[PDB]
Design a protein around this nucleic acid. Structure first.
Ligand SMILES: *[C@@H]1O[C@H](CO)[C@@H](O[C@@H]2O[C@H](CO)[C@@H](O)[C@H](O)[C@H]2NC(C)=O)[C@H](O)[C@H]1NC(C)=O
Ligand SMILES: *[C@@H]1O[C@H](CO)[C@@H](O)[C@H](O)[C@H]1NC(C)=O
Ligand SMILES: *[C@@H]1O[C@H](CO)[C@@H](O)[C@H](O)[C@H]1NC(C)=O
Length: 752
DNA sequence: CCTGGATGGG
């Protein structure tokens, strides 16, 4: 059977996906098609500029419709093409089950007639400049209205978006409203008191007072930021907030007892008026980023009485000249008893010390601390020891330089105490730096210029440490006692550390890897390991090893010295040998890899032959990756029976032919990637029988030979369930006037 | 609100 919704793709949760197919209009699907199954239709970034009553009229259970970027207004078109979308008047009424609709980045100047089942309506970056009681009349179920971007630089209009007083009163269930980037100077008048999220940011509302939020007592989130900006570090156009502005009257927000979030970022504030935050019992999030409060936060009392607050953002409150604030936190920070996350990155200051963060020190739930990009040069890392509930500290992108004078490398997210000092200016690591941080589980020291000797002396205090990311440095040699001072180390990143000249006439000693009873994950990626090095990695504990970006080729080219170089890794699971220039492979080299291997990568090497009869020597292999190599064929022995294989990636080769039955004996094989190759066809004789047993079979980007009527078509229809993107991303290489078109296209739908 | 640090998403 043809795929039902050609040229579109059916997908989980009744999603017809028509995105990105260059469509001039909406597909009228066949009568055969299960239209009752379609609960969501997606036509993103096609070029549909005309909508008709008959378009979605037969989609009885349709609830989600996405027509975004179909007719971009002049401003938003790369080439400034004007576009105006005509919509027939019953276009949407014909869809009485419709619940959500995205009309954004389209050329419409008025709202269409919409059905009363609508619940969410997006009209962002359209040309509607007027909203009054007639626009959305009777949308009683409508909870979400978003209309951002209808009048600003990328899509201008010569005046302010008009929202008549009480335009939206009719929407008695509306709880969410977005009207950013619309060139408003005042907050509309009498918005639905049902509202819970009002976002009026990035307009030109320079004056606010209680009158403006009259009757809006259900607000839980309010964003009025960006309305009078500092424009010295953008990027795009920007009206500078004029001299004696903004003007927030002290009790502007006083009556919003239920309010949980308040955003005043980029509002040209020099002072905090504590009367703003009075009455705000339930405030959990406050965003003061991008103002001028360097001076205010050494002395302010406006945080007195914000007890429930959990996230406070102060990032980018720097002196506009680009210089240091001198910094102690006002003691009222101490009143933020519920504080969980404090953002202070990009304020710019010189010294981190006990004074600096004093009132915070004993806040009991403070967990996260963003201090990056602050150009600090004197840190006192010990101040942090007794913080009761710390877990993450971002101190990257500063100028600290000492004390005071994923399958292959897991993330530190679930871990309990983490310190990132990356992109600092450390040349050498003192052990005493880490005197007070024995509780650390993760230490990120990448992208310094660390050119020291590791010998066991460097990380002595760090006896809880499990993750040590030392990548992107110049670590000058590796010894038998390196990292042994870290008893509990579970994962170690030594990638991008290449000093082949500063070696002192010798090479790395890698025995230390044997000396680390906790170690699972190790990266030596891109270290340029050419020669002169240990002959056996041994570890009874190691689960995964990244060797990508070195020169295993060189090593195995050199006699039988390094042919057991991975053998000692008795526990191994994963091994990345990508980008090692491997031009060839001995049957003797592949038997010498740990019997336990489950995942193996060989991406981007120059292998043009590969002995599949030798996968018997890896009785546990489940995944093998040969992507981006030089294979002319899948031949020279087929896939041996018994093999446990599940994922085979041979993408980006030059496979022009496969021998019959190759994949047949691969009984467990569930994922196959033959994409980007020289395949003129696709045969079932390759899979013996067992065709519809694969779950994912990728044959896109192949010069398929669409001859009326070729033999890959029966096979692919018959297993379509496993061919991702069969309806459009599987394409003809030939003949001529089908080149680059889909194997189903208008001159092939007449030959099936 | 989320996201970054600029802006666009829901
Ligand atoms: C099969 O491999 C191909 C190419 O190796 C994959 O196609 C790429 O997909 C990645 C994302 O996973 C993108 O970075 C690229 O844009 C894609 N490139 C091309 C040319 O298509 C493909 O994803 C793999 N197949 C499957 C099902 O994952
Ligand atoms: C915003 O409104 C002002 C005042 O009427 C107008 O002069 C300006 O051009 C408008 N901005 C845009 C981007 O259309
Ligand atoms: C590696 O480990 C130890 C240093 O702790 C040393 O005694 C041994 O000789 C080293 N091996 C090589 C081959 O350099």
């Amino acid at each position: 059977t043809l795929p039902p919704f050609l040229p579109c793709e059916l997908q989980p949760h009744g999603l017809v996906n028509c995105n990105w197919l260059f469509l001039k209009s909406v597909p009228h699907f066949s009568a055969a098609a299960p239209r009752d199954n379609v609960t969501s239709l997606s036509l993103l970034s096609n070029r549909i500029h005309h909508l008709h009553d008959s378009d979605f009229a037969q989609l009885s259970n349709l609830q989600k419709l996405n027509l975004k970027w179909n007719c971009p207004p002049a401003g938003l078109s790369p080439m400034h093409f004007p576009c105006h979308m005509t919509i027939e008047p019953n276009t949407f009424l014909a869809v009485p089950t419709l619940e959500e609709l995205n009309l954004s980045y389209n050329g419409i100047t008025t709202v269409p007639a919409l059905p009363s089942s609508l619940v969410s309506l997006i009209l962002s970056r359209t040309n509607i400049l007027q909203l009054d009681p007639t626009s959305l009349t009777g949308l009683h179920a409508l909870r979400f209205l978003y209309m951002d971007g209808n009048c600003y630089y990328k899509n201008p209009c010569g005046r302010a978006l008009e929202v008549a007083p009480g335009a939206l009163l009719g929407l008695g269930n509306l709880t969410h409203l977005s009207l950013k980037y619309n060139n408003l100077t005042t907050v509309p008048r009498s918005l639905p008191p049902s509202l819970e999220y009002l976002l009026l940011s990035y307009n030109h509302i320079v004056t606010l007072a209680p009158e403006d939020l009259a009757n809006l007592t259900a607000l839980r989130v309010l964003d009025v930021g960006g309305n009078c900006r500092r424009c010295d570090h953008a990027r795009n156009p920007c009206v500078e907030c004029p001299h004696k502005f903004p003007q927030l009257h002290s009790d502007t927000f006083s009556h919003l007892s239920r309010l949980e979030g308040l955003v005043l970022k980029d509002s040209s504030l020099y002072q905090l008026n504590p009367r703003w935050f009075r009455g705000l019992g339930n405030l959990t999030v406050l965003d003061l980023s991008e103002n001028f409060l360097y001076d205010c936060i050494t002395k302010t009392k406006a945080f007195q009485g914000l007890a429930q607050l959990r996230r406070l953002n102060l990032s980018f409150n720097y002196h506009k000249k680009v210089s240091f604030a001198h910094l102690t936190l006002a003691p009222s920070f101490g009143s933020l008893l519920s504080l969980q996350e404090l953002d202070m990155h990009g304020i710019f200051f010189r010294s981190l010390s006990q004074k600096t963060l004093q009132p915070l020190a004993r806040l009991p739930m403070l967990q996260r601390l963003y201090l990056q990009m602050n150009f600090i040069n004197q840190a006192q890392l010990g101040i942090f020891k007794d913080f009761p509930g710390l877990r993450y500290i971002d101190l990257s992108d500063n100028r600290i330089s000492g004390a005071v004078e994923e399958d292959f490398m897991p993330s530190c997210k679930n871990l309990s105490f983490t310190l990132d000092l990356s992109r600092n200016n450390l040349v050498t690591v003192q052990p005493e730096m880490f005197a007070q941080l024995s509780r650390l589980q993760c230490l990120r020291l990448s992208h310094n210029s660390i050119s020291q000797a590791v010998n066991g002396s460097q990380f002595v205090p760090l006896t809880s440490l499990q993750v040590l990311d030392l990548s992107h440095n110049k670590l000058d040699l590796y010894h038998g006692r390196s990292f042994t001072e870290l008893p509990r180390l579970e994962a170690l990143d030594l990638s991008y550390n290449s000093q082949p000249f500063s070696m002192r006439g010798v090479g790395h000693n890698l025995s230390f890897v044997a000396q680390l009873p906790t170690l699972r994950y190790l990266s030596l990626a891109h270290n340029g390991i050419h020669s002169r090095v240990s002959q056996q990695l041994c570890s009874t504990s190691l689960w995964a090893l990244d060797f990508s970006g070195n020169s295993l080729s060189q090593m195995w080219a050199e006699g039988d010295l390094y042919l057991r170089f991975f053998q000692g890794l008795r526990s191994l699971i994963r091994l990345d040998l990508s980008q090692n220039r491997l031009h060839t492979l001995l049957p003797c080299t592949l038997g010498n890899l740990p019997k336990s291997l489950q995942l193996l990568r060989l991406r981007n090497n120059y292998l043009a032959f590969f002995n599949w009869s030798s996968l018997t020597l890896l009785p546990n292999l489940e995944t093998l990756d040969l992507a981006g190599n030089q294979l002319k064929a899948l031949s020279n022995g087929s896939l041996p029976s018994g093999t446990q294989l599940q994922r085979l990636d041979v993408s980006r080769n030059s496979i022009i032919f496969v021998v019959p039955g190759f994949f047949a004996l691969a009984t467990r094989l569930r994922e196959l990637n033959l994409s980007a190759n020289a395949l003129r066809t696709v045969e079932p004789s390759w899979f013996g029988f067992l065709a519809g047993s694969l779950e994912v079979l990728d044959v896109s980007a192949n010069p398929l030979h669409c001859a009326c009527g070729a033999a890959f078509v029966d096979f692919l229809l018959q297993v379509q369930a496993a061919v991702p993107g069969l309806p459009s991303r599987v394409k003809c290489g030939s003949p001529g006037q089908l080149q680059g078109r889909s194997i189903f296209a208008q001159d092939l739908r007449l030959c099936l």
